[PDB]
Design a protein around this ligand. Sequence first.
Ligand SMILES: CCCCCCCCCCCCO[C@@H]1O[C@H](CO)[C@@H](O[C@H]2O[C@H](CO)[C@@H](O)[C@H](O)[C@H]2O)[C@H](O)[C@H]1O
Ligand SMILES: CCCCCCCCCCCCO[C@@H]1O[C@H](CO)[C@@H](O[C@H]2O[C@H](CO)[C@@H](O)[C@H](O)[C@H]2O)[C@H](O)[C@H]1O
Ligand SMILES: CCCCCCCCCCCCO[C@@H]1O[C@H](CO)[C@@H](O[C@H]2O[C@H](CO)[C@@H](O)[C@H](O)[C@H]2O)[C@H](O)[C@H]1O
Ligand SMILES: *Cc1c(C)c(=O)n2c(=O)c(C)c(C)n12
Ligand SMILES: *Cc1c(C)c(=O)n2c(=O)c(C)c(C)n12
Ligand SMILES: [Br-]
Ligand SMILES: [Br-]
Ligand SMILES: [Br-]
Ligand SMILES: [Br-]
Ligand SMILES: [Br-]
Ligand code: NA
Ligand code: NA
Ligand code: NA
Ligand code: NA
Lengths: 311, 311, 311, 311, 311
Amino acid sequence: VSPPPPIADEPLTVNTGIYLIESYSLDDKAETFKVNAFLSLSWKDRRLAFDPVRSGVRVKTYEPEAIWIPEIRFVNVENARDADVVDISVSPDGTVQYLERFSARVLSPLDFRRYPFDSQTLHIYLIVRSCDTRNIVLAVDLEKVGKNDDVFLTGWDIESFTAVVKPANFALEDRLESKLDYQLRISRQYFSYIPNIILPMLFILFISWTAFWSTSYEANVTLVVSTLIAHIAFNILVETNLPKTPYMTYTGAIIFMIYLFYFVAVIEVTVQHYLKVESQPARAASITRASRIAFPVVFLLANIILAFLFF
Amino acid sequence: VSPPPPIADEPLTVNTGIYLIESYSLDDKAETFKVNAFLSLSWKDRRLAFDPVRSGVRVKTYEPEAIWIPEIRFVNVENARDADVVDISVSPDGTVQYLERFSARVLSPLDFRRYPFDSQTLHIYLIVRSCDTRNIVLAVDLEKVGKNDDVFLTGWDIESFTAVVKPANFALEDRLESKLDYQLRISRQYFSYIPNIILPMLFILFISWTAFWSTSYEANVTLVVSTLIAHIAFNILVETNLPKTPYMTYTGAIIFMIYLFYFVAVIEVTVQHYLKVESQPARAASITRASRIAFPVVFLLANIILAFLFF
Amino acid sequence: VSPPPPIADEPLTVNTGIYLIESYSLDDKAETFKVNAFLSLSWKDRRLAFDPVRSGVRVKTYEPEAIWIPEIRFVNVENARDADVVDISVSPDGTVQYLERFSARVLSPLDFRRYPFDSQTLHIYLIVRSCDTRNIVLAVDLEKVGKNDDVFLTGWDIESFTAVVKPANFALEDRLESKLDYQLRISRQYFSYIPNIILPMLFILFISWTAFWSTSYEANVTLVVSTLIAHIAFNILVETNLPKTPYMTYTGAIIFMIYLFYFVAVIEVTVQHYLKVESQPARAASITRASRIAFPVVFLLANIILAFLFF
Amino acid sequence: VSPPPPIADEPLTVNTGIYLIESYSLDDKAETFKVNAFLSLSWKDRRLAFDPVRSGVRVKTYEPEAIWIPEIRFVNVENARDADVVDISVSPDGTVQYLERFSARVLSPLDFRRYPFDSQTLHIYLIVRSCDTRNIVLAVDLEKVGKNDDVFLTGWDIESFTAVVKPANFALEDRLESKLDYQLRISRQYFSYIPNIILPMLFILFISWTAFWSTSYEANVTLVVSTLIAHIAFNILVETNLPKTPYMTYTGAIIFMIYLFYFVAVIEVTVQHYLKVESQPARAASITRASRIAFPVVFLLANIILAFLFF
Amino acid sequence: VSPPPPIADEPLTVNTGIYLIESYSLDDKAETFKVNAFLSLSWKDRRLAFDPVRSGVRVKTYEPEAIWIPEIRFVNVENARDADVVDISVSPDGTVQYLERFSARVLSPLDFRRYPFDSQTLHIYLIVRSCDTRNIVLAVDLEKVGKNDDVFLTGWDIESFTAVVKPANFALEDRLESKLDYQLRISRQYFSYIPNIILPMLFILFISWTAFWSTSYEANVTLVVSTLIAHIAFNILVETNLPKTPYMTYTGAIIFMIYLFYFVAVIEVTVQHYLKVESQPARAASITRASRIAFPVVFLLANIILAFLFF
Ligand SMILES: CCCCCCCCCCCCO[C@@H]1O[C@H](CO)[C@@H](O[C@H]2O[C@H](CO)[C@@H](O)[C@H](O)[C@H]2O)[C@H](O)[C@H]1O
Ligand SMILES: CCCCCCCCCCCCO[C@@H]1O[C@H](CO)[C@@H](O[C@H]2O[C@H](CO)[C@@H](O)[C@H](O)[C@H]2O)[C@H](O)[C@H]1O
Ligand SMILES: CCCCCCCCCCCCO[C@@H]1O[C@H](CO)[C@@H](O[C@H]2O[C@H](CO)[C@@H](O)[C@H](O)[C@H]2O)[C@H](O)[C@H]1O
Ligand SMILES: *Cc1c(C)c(=O)n2c(=O)c(C)c(C)n12
Ligand SMILES: *Cc1c(C)c(=O)n2c(=O)c(C)c(C)n12
Ligand SMILES: [Br-]
Ligand SMILES: [Br-]
Ligand SMILES: [Br-]
Ligand SMILES: [Br-]
Ligand SMILES: [Br-]
Ligand code: NA
Ligand code: NA
Ligand code: NA
Ligand code: NA
């Protein structure tokens, strides 16, 4: 058991293919997903070749220990894949067809800038380290790349599973390394965010705006402050589903902006109350009247400016 | 070892059975369940046939490594079954009788549209990959498919555990696979949702309707804003027990509709105050007297419309 | 290695014993507990008998692989017993003495009807599948059943640890099975529930009843609505410590009933206000006075009936 | 492999030593802690003795399997010590010196009566079961019992790490067991409980006492009920850090006593209003004037009583 | 297997290298992180010398079991380094080049004094115990120490990953120990804390300050008491993300000091009302007008003092 020697000075080509059986547990905070797939490996080992006419047998089956198998590891896995060899088949010309079913927790970063209207490119990097004798290079067997029809990822729409055919051949620790980029394209199912977070968040805001058709300070203070407490509950709820990002997200931007609206609604209610008491209810009346228009208008404009800057 | 060779060109039939010992951890969010069971496998191996006279035994026992055992895998498992071999019995005619105990975390999707009055079909998919030498096909021994009477799933009623006798034969990575479907039929114990969520949620909503028999804006603002906040707490409570769906759930639809009632109630409470300050209490009294009948009637009709759409 | 042959037509008796070293992590929601114990097994293997006079030795020690050891399993375990053999000692007459230390996560159902004044009988089921050669039956050596004095289950009182001596012998999948039931009797330490849940829930209820000595609607609405919010927090807290049950638990019934009290207090506070505005304070004052007695009287009588129906 | 035979009838002495490398994860609810340490064992096995002159080596190194090593176990571990043998050295006189690196999750009860001003004695119980051939006894080599200087336990001060030199020899299932007690003495770092829980809790209590300088029932009902609701939040927060105990903790006692204050303050607030409504504001004023002193005085006294009964 | 012999009285030098592939799960409460890296080891074993002309090959490849490998361990790991040998390469002079891929949960203490504007120096300690035969000493091959350009730590910026080349050679349990210190430098991405915690906390504080432009006690009590409860919820939120420290953190100091502001504001609100009721509103007016400046000014200066004391 050693690497097959080169006929010419060319490197050994290991043809690879990942076929997803199950995809599950997409954790946003962890920036990880779990997977259950087939890993297909194919290379030519002439030392294994045989005569089809003399032998009579079309294909030969070997055990992993018996023959040389390349060390294909995963770059971005949390804990090293639970592998189980399914098949090793040699053709008369010495072409080896390897197949293992594995499962791995893959650490792939996410871009939350457009959350919950985001799309992500999940990655699964395959790698091979070349030895002192000869270089090993990875290739994509597009016939052996894919995903089973039923494959679902709770909370997401699965768009594609395609590998980048050209490997990344680079030298790390004075040895050649061949890296392949498999890509799982997914788009988030935003539907639930509308009845459970967005619409409730807007209702409570519109309720704070009924203070603009009220002269009762005590009621207004109750309106604006109670609803601001329910806004904090939602901000908190939202941030528990997401990691701490060094940029603003879309929901994050709306949520923050709404705080300023509360602060101003509070100011307005204070000003209105101060003018009444100072016996200026007509000046106060003019400010509430403008506020009935300004507050929903400036809200609608600011939300457009945001949607534009994010999409 | 190699698979038993065919007499003619027939496929190799492996009779299967699953016997549930324990069922536990139905996790709605992750759409999984844990299982503890027996797995029975049976197949003819002529190379193992023996004469009972010159052996003095009706059956022979073997170690898994001693004979050929079919590579039977599970399709929908989070982590590959923890398996232990119990018994291996070879009859005189060469009929092998395998038995193992396994435990696995199974990934099977759920339909939350009628939550929490829903039923589910839990699947356990058994599979076998065919060989170049010969094609392997799965079968169901109906006398070896069951569950003991003690088997319980916390918060669920276990209805049935049956298998779809006809395997789905198809090609995968240029080899024939034979897939079997074991179906565990469960229905949710909705009981607890009534005194813990449904009724508490209705009581706080009815409590907001007492504002229709009150002339006090300050009081009304307290009644409608404080109950709206307890409703937000139930919305959050409910959505913790469930995953994000691209569809509306039954509970979720009731929960959403109830926010509209709070919004309209705030409007009526607002309108009534405005009219009373404008020295139009007679108009306001008409709106409030109407609301007293309108709010319970519209609620009662809307719930009939929803129960009908969902069931 | 093969099972010992019978002298008469009799089955092989494997004498069992479980000695608890540690008990921990009783999870009410999961309906599981963890244990660390000794599993003692004893049977006669004539093939191992020897002469004490000539051998000089009393006992002969073996490694597990050297001799035949019966296949004893646990029916109700989530994560399979992590075993390590401590001793195998053979007496001159061939009586084998097996002793292993194991740890398992046992799945035993719990009856929450009387929570938090509940008592449970946790079970550990030992099992053995009989061979085609001969039948194996389990038995209890009471001399090797018990527990360490330092055994504690946080939040519980350990009452007893006995075994049901008569095994349950039944036919499962055309083979005989022998089942033993070890019973760990515990009673819940209700103490904490009094100063943390029960009494705080009563204080807030009584605070709602101070509205019966008040003529301020605005104040009463705050009293009953605020305390109802704190009541919900306790309902939520309580139900997070428990699994969803298809029956009413004791605390569950009390917590539910208290909602009816708040609902009726809101009705009274509403009615009293309505009359005051309708310029009928005399009738209002009559209802408020009757409510001062009616509410704590009906609460006391409702609780007596509940305590009676539960205990 | 059997134990060394007794020269005279004396039992075999195994000298033990635990040296802490890392201490982490003290879990109050689970009453566990995790440790990373060296375990050293030393015993005389004459069957291994050698002459330094003839052999030309003063030390002899063996594999665990090659010689006899005592089966030393831990009594109170959840999941059994993950051990890797570092070295086994035999001196010319046959004095075996064994060293291993282990890591275990140790179960050891905690006394919460003085929380968060408490001190704990964590135990690590080493044990040995004797043979039918001969008796085994444990000893402590005080030269090999310690901890690294950088050893820390998050939120705790490490006081000591010593062993109770005299074992606790006893009968278990008619065999001698020698048990040793290693003790890790720790005291909880209470510092952060002060700004995070104690002082916040006192501030909201003192804020409820401002109701005593207010004639406004409506404002008073707000002060006392809102602060009562924040007290429930701290009661809840605190009890999520602790297991349920059948005794009262220090913080628990203060937390409970503080509820009784809230109830009495509600009564005073209620009574004051009643008298004012009855045109008795003079009687009501004297009750409120008494309350202003009585509440802080009865509070400071009851805390003196409590600190005395707890420390 | 035993250590290679020395040519002279020199110790055996083992060259080390750690190459980070993945860094993840920085858990503040636990004071841990998870890493996935390459561990390179290099030492001379002349007993392994060979002739390339005789053997055929220029480099020999071995199985770990076939040769002596130094017992290099990690000091501060919670989860056992899940290791897998990638390559073992022996050159003609006997120079061994060992490559293993590992993953571990490193426990390294964090200083939260400047949280969330803090920086950390995470450590991975390599170690080796010396034999009686000969001493082993660790060394750093700077050419094999590093991290892949993609390495990211969610919520942190990775500054550097270098080693402290001079090992800590010391005595432990009468044997030589050689320790290496690999240091991973990180600075916390404070961005998210501003829109999610810091500014929402300031908005609610300023909302309470509107009570200085109000003569309404019932409203003011609502303003200061409601925002105080929202502050409590932030304090609870902040401390769920942090361990209990025996010192004050920066956020912790601000959070605490802000409660003193809420307490003083309540005092002023109480004073203002008392005077207004005592028929001295002019005095109240002077206290309220001063408060309008004093509260923001004392808040400004207090934060300047704090920021100066912490940074
Ligand atoms: C006045 C202000 C009051 C503030 C109110 C804020 C309410 C906050 C409610 C948080 C609910 C907790 O739930 C938050 O969301 C998702 C579930 O949806 C969690 O996700 C969790 O799901 C499951 C089930 O709960 C857990 O077993 C698992 O450990 C975790 O992955 C986040 O880890 C948690 O942080
Ligand atoms: C306006 C309304 C406001 C409503 C606010 C309600 C607040 C509710 C606070 C919930 C308290 C936190 O929730 C607490 O979480 C811990 C996990 O850390 C759970 O922990 C539990 O786990 C297992 C299940 O895995 C249980 O069998 C076990 O008894 C317990 O240890 C507690 O059962 C839950 O009570
Ligand atoms: C992972 C675990 C997650 C745990 C989640 C914890 C949830 C905590 C929810 C806290 C909800 C607090 O909700 C709080 O209730 C009070 C009850 O008086 C309500 O307060 C209401 O009454 C008071 C009078 O008593 C008024 O001052 C206030 O204006 C009014 O809104 C508020 O609407 C809200 O500030
Ligand atoms: C073809 C075949 C069968 C059925 C079998 O058991 N073995 C193996 O183990 C391999 C993977 C192959 C091929 N064969
Ligand atoms: C003496 C000895 C050794 C060799 C061993 O492993 N154990 C056991 O398992 C027993 C029963 C005895 C004694 N010891
Ligand atoms: Br891998
Ligand atoms: Br499987
Ligand atoms: Br088992
Ligand atoms: Br152990
Ligand atoms: Br290690
Ligand atoms: Na190989
Ligand atoms: Na086989
Ligand atoms: Na055996
Ligand atoms: Na080795």
